[PDB]
Amino acid sequence: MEPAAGSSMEPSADWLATAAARGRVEEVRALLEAGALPNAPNSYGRRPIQVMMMGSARVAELLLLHGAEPNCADPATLTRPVHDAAREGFLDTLVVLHRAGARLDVRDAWGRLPVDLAEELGHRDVARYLRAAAGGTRGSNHARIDAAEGPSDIPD
């Protein structure tokens, strides 16, 4: 019932993802190399990089070079960390994921894709390299077999 203050030998563990999300490359570079856990249980059901500052491929590299979860996503929203790169209009982040084992052809639990999200915001440059690694199919004026992927029922 009475919590204590202190009594810990270098509590370095979730400080890796935290700094990443706070645009802190030097904070993690030191922690990450000090033993920061890349697969640490984040409190946002997210990943070690999916939460890092997407405006700095340098961070993702720190977690990726070490072994973050550039592929794993969320079993609840399937928010793949590949969207964080394109969604933020960052391409250097996507290459890194692909440079170190990272699936970039998945679909958020809803029914979207990492390449489509970029076509909405304004990262066509990031969505381009994505449509290539996010599925072999690449037809501009074509259309796979009628298979709406998402919620049942299709209300016009």
Swiss-Prot record:
Effect ascribed to mutating E26D: In a biliary tract tumor
Consequence of changing D84H: In non-small cell lung carcinoma
Biological process terms in GO annotation: apoptotic process involved in mammary gland involution; cellular response to hydrogen peroxide; cellular senescence; glucose homeostasis; keratinocyte differentiation; keratinocyte proliferation; mammary gland epithelial cell proliferation; negative regulation of cell growth
Post-translational modifications: Phosphorylation seems to increase interaction with CDK4.
Domain of life: Eukaryota
Effect listed in the UniProt record for changing G23D: In a pancreas tumor and a melanoma; loss of CDK4 binding
One GO CC annotation: nucleus
Impact noted for substituting G67R: In CMM2; partial loss of CDK4 binding
Resulting phenotype, P81T: In CMM2; loss of CDK4 binding
Known outcome of mutating R124H: In an esophagus tumor
Ranges of the ANK repeats in the UniProt entry: 11-40, 44-72, 77-106, 110-139
Compartment(s): Cytoplasm; Nucleus
UniProt keywords, alphabetically: Acetylation, ANK repeat, Cell cycle, Cytoplasm, Disease variant, Li-Fraumeni syndrome, Nucleus, Phosphoprotein, Repeat, Tumor suppressor
Principal cellular location given in the protein's record: cytoplasm
Effect of D14E: In a biliary tract tumor
One term of GO molecular function: RNA binding
Coiled coil stretches, renumbered: none
Residue numbers of N-acetylmethionine PTMs: M1
Phenotype for T93A: In non-small cell lung carcinoma
Record PTM Phosphoserine, positions in chain: S7, S8, S140, S152
Tissue spec. comment: Widely expressed but not detected in brain or skeletal muscle. Isoform 3 is pancreas-specific.
Disease: The association between cutaneous and uveal melanomas in some families suggests that mutations in CDKN2A may account for a proportion of uveal melanomas. However, CDKN2A mutations are rarely found in uveal melanoma patients. Melanoma, cutaneous malignant 2: A malignant neoplasm of melanocytes, arising de novo or from a pre-existing benign nevus, which occurs most often in the skin but may also involve other sites.
Similarity comment: family membership: Belongs to the CDKN2 cyclin-dependent kinase inhibitor family.
UniProt protein name: Cyclin-dependent kinase inhibitor 2A
Organism: Homo sapiens
Lineage of origin: Eukaryota, Metazoa, Chordata, Craniata, Vertebrata
